[PDB]
Design a protein around this nucleic acid. Sequence first.
DNA 1: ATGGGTCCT
DNA 2: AGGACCC
Length: 377
Amino acid sequence: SSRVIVHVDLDCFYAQVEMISNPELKDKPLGVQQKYLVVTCNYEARKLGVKKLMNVRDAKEKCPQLVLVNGEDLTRYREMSYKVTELLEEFSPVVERLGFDENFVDLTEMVEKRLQQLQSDELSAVTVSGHVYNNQSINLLDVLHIRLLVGSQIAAEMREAMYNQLGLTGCAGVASNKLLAKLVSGVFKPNQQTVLLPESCQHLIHSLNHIKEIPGIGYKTAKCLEALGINSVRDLQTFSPKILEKELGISVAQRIQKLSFGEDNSPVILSGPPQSFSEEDSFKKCSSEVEAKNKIEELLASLLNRVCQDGRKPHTVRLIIRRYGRESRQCPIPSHVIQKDVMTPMVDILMKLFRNMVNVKMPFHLTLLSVCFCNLK
DNA sequence: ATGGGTCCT
DNA sequence: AGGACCC
Ligand SMILES: Cc1cn([C@H]2C[C@H](O)[C@@H](COP(=O)(O)OP(=O)(O)OP(=O)(O)O)O2)c(=O)[nH]c1=O
Ligand SMILES: [Mg+2]
Ligand SMILES: [Mg+2]
C-alpha cells in the first residue's frame, strides 16, 4: 500500500565487467562492441563524446584513443548479472530483474522491521544516505519521509555489498513505487543514489522532456502519441481518456496515462530463474541452407552448454529469423531428447522449422538467426 | 541497430 | 506466432 521500493542500476555494466577482467582497460577509454555497434562504454569514453549504441565508425572518429573489446558473447555479463540479483535477494527474497543490469526490491517489510527496533529518541536521529531528489527538506515527523530514509540506508548497504563482494558499482533510487524508483535512480550518476520524497514527485515526472522517457512508453506508443499531438508528460496527463482509449485500447491508454501522473501500483515480482535461454547471431547475408544449418549448429552447441548448468531442461524449441520484423516457428522437444549425442536429433527439428518459414528452393536473404530454449520445467 | 529478456493478445 | 515493452 505505502511502499518503499529500490531500483538498482549498474554503471556501464558490460564495460565494468570488461574492466574488472582486464584492469589494463580501467584507466583507458573503453567501448564494448557488438558487430558494428558500441553497445556501451565506460565513463571515460562518455566524456569524449561516445554514446551508447553508437556506430563504431562514429565512436572511433569521435575518440581515436577508444579501446574496443568484443561483447557479443554475453556469458560473463549474464553470470555477473545473476550474482548481483542473488546478492540482493539476501536482503529481501522478492527481487525483480529488468534486463541484465537492473533490479527492483520491495524494501517495505525490511523498513518496517528496522523501524520497530528503533526507540523514540532514535528516530531523531534517522539520516539519509545519498542525495534527496530536488534537494527537498526532510521532515522527520513525517512517517513517509522516515520510511524512505531507512530505504536509502538499505540501498547504500546494498550498493556497498555489491562493491565489497562483487567489485561492482551502481546507482540506486528509492521511491514509493517502481516507476518513480527507476526514474529517480538515474538523477545522479555514476555510482550515486537518490531518494524521492512524495512532495517532489510532480517535479520528477515533469523534469522529463520526452514522453518515451517513461518506462512503459516505447517506440510505437510514443510515435502514436506524437501523431495525436501529445509531446510532454503534461499533454498526456491532460489528454482526453476517451480519445486515448479509442486510439491505443483500454489497457495501454489507462496504464500509460496513470504512468504520466507518476502512479504505478505494479508489485515487485520475484523473477527467479529465467523463463528462457536463447543465442543469437546477426549477419550481412545468409542465402544458403547449408550455411544456415552450420549457423544453427553453433547456436545449439552454446545453448546446450547452458542447458544444463542450471540443471533444468527446456520443453520447447523455437527458431527465429529476420529477412531482408521477425518471424518464428516453435514446437515441443521430444521427451527422449529432453532427458539431458543430443545435437543430431536437435538440428533436424530446427531445419524442419527453418524450411517451414523459408522456401529454400526459392532465393532467400536472412540477416538474423536465433534459437530459443523455452518452457522450462 | 546488438544480444538478449519480459508479459499479453 | 506476433507484437508491445525493457535492458
Ligand atoms: C539498451 C541496451 C543495453 N544493452 C546492454 C549494455 C549495457 O551495459 C547493459 C545495461 O544497459 P544500461 O543500464 O541501459 O546502460 P549501462 O549500464 O551500460 O550504462 P549506465 O551507466 O548509463 O547505466 O545492457 C545492450 O546490449 N543493448 C541495448 O540495446
Ligand atoms: Mg541506465
Ligand atoms: Mg546500467
